[PDB]
Amino acid sequence: TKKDRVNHCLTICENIVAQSVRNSPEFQKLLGIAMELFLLCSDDAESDVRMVADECLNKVIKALMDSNLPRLQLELYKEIKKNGAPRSLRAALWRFAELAHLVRPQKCRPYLVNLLPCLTRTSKRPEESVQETLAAAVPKIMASFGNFANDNEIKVLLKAFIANLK
Amino acid sequence: TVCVQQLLKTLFGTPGLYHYCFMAPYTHFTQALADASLRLFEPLVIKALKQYTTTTCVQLQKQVLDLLAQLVQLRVNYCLLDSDQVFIGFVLKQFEYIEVGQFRESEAIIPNIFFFLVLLSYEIGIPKIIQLCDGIMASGRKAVTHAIPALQPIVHDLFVLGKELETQKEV
Amino acid sequence: SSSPTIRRTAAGSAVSICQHSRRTQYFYSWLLNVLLGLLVPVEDEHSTLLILGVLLTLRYLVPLLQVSPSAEQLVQVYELTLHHTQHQDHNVVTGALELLQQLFRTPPPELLQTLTAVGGIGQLTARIKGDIGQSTDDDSAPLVHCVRLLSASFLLTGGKNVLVPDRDVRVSVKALALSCVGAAVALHPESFFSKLYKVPLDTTEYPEEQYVSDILNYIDHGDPQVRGATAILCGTLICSILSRSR
Numbered sequence: 001t002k003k004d005r006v007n008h009c010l011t012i013c014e015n016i017v018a019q020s021v022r023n024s025p026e027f028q029k030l031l032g033i034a035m036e037l038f039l040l041c042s043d044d045a046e047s048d049v050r051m052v053a054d055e056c057l058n059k060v061i062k063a064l065m066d067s068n069l070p071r072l073q074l075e076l077y078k079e080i081k082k083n084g085a086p087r088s089l090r091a092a093l094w095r096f097a098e099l100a101h102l103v104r105p106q107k108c109r110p111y112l113v114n115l116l117p118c119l120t121r122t123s124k125r126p127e128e129s130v131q132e133t134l135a136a137a138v139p140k141i142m143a144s145f146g147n148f149a150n151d152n153e154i155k156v157l158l159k160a161f162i163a164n165l166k
Numbered sequence: 167t168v169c170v171q172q173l174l175k176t177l178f179g180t181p182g183l184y185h186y187c188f189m190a191p192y193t194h195f196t197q198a199l200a201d202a203s204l205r206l207f208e209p210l211v212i213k214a215l216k217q218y219t220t221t222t223c224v225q226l227q228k229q230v231l232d233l234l235a236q237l238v239q240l241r242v243n244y245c246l247l248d249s250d251q252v253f254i255g256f257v258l259k260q261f262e263y264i265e266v267g268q269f270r271e272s273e274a275i276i277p278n279i280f281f282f283l284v285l286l287s288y289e290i291g292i293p294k295i296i297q298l299c300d301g302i303m304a305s306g307r308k309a310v311t312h313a314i315p316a317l318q319p320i321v322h323d324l325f326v327l328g329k330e331l332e333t334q335k336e337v
Numbered sequence: 338s339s340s341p342t343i344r345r346t347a348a349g350s351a352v353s354i355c356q357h358s359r360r361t362q363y364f365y366s367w368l369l370n371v372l373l374g375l376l377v378p379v380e381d382e383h384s385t386l387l388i389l390g391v392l393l394t395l396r397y398l399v400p401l402l403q404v405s406p407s408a409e410q411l412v413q414v415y416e417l418t419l420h421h422t423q424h425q426d427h428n429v430v431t432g433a434l435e436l437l438q439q440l441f442r443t444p445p446p447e448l449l450q451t452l453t454a455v456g457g458i459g460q461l462t463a464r465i466k467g468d469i470g471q472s473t474d475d476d477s478a479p480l481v482h483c484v485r486l487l488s489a490s491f492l493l494t495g496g497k498n499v500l501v502p503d504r505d506v507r508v509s510v511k512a513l514a515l516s517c518v519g520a521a522v523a524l525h526p527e528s529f530f531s532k533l534y535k536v537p538l539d540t541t542e543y544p545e546e547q548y549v550s551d552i553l554n555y556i557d558h559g560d561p562q563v564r565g566a567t568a569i570l571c572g573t574l575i576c577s578i579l580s581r582s583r
């Protein structure tokens with residue numbers, strides 16, 4: 001079913017954008033379930049499957065950065081705390097630094113407290129590919145989530161990375 | 167909206183090295199001393215207000231405070247918010263994020279936040295407008311970005327343009 | 338709230354406290370500031386169930402208005418209703434017409450001198466198809482103005498002595514409009530002899546212009562409380578010419 005797995009991921013994408021109905025109590029349940037399913041298509045190891053279904057997850061986000069941004073960013077914080085595979089956790093981390101400057105400052109302070117437990121585990125990970133993309137997100141995340149933390153939260157985070165100089 | 171800001175204007179009518187080194191700069195000196203001895207928009211307008219509450223780029227937040235200072239001069243009746251006061255409640259909350267500092271690019275919006283507020287009061291009143299500006303100065307960031315561009319909309323729209331108006335000029 | 342039983346029990350609770358609160362006159366001026374921001378400028382959407390909440394607390398408090406409630410606070414109450422005798426409904430048209438029958442019978446004495454006066458409202462600031470002349474104009478009292486307005490919208494057509502049909506305006510709505518024209522003649526008797534339109538209305542269409550005397554052709558109109566409320570419109574027109582000119 002290696003060619004049967006390719007056709008499954010791509011038909012879920014087009015029937016969300018062509019709904020033209022958002023913020024609905026029917027439309028809220030559908031976007032949570034099949035959003036985690038876009039990354040299992042990338043988690044399966046084949047370059048015909050890994051290249052094809054990762055460009056398809058980007059069709060969903062950009063057509064929904066206007067309409068459903070608070071629904072998009074709630075399913076996505078869940079996967080880092082899942083602390084999954086080094087291929088699954090990686091390509092989700094591109095998506096979350098580019099939407100950091102799209103949050104509102106009304107909802108920002110709940111998003112800061114939840115990441116510092118999640119941003120220390122991916123500093124303790126010895127996978128040399130997982131450690132690379134974090135040096136292209138800690139530039140982008142903590143510049144827009146920078147000002148919202150006190151002097152207590154930021155002294156904990158810098159004692160961890162120096163133990164990654166060892 | 168820069169495409170929409172303009173349509174509504176025109177749908178509603180609207181020398182030889184002694185001169186240069188000495189003799190030309192020596193005589194701008196002595197001349198300023200003698201003077202010192204002296205509605206198809208209704209579908210399109212409603213969509214632009216849902217964007218300001220939910221965006222974060224502050225190049226877009228600056229061109230939406232000039233689209234609403236033109237609907238009050240050109241007297242469009244205050245029916246953009248037909249029942250409630252949805253949009254004017256959201257401008258008051260943004261003053262909470264600048265004083266503490268929980269706002270990213272307050273510099274390029276604080277000259278245009280305060281032009282929208284004073285021009286509505288001729289129809290939030292000028293008692294309430296000047297209590298907001300006193301918070302930013304003493305309790306907030308430095309002056310040459312926040313506090314000093316905060317009063318360029320007020321002073322030009324209060325000193326240039328009965329007994330109630332006398333007490334507010336002392337403040 | 339939207340229930341007719343729950344709207345009239347919250348209105349008689351605000352007004353029974355201010356008779357007994359601590360300062361009976363200080364708490365009358367405070368309920369008039371809260372309610373007119375609920376109807377601050379009238380050209381808005383005002384949630385027409387909530388328009389009926391403000392006019393029922395004011396039928397219970399005008400009996401009690403006779404820092405104080407100011408003479409410029411009470412003239413903001415009065416222009417608020419003439420816009421609301423025109424705002425279409427049958428539950429919102431009947432709400433501002435019981436409020437006007439009672440403010441002429443038991444008027445507050447600050448409001449009562451600003452309407453009989455010749456300039457009137459002009460010193461305080463410093464179905465209808467004609468130039469009536471609003472309640473800001475000089476050279477006429479505002480009670481000369483307020484009888485021209487409640488007639489051509491409810492119970493009179495500006496061309497000829499003719500009844501308005503009961504299909505257009507209900508005969509529960511035509512009953513409260515004959516009792517408001519009678520309580521003002523006891524206050525300002527020169528209104529009943531006035532012309533209906535100030536600028537005359539189109540002599541091409543209509544042969545003759547009429548005065549407000551076709552109010553007194555509703556003795557033949559059908560039910561009680563219209564022939565009985567033009568029975569009472571001729572009672573206080575004779576009571577108040579004899580006491581006006583001695």
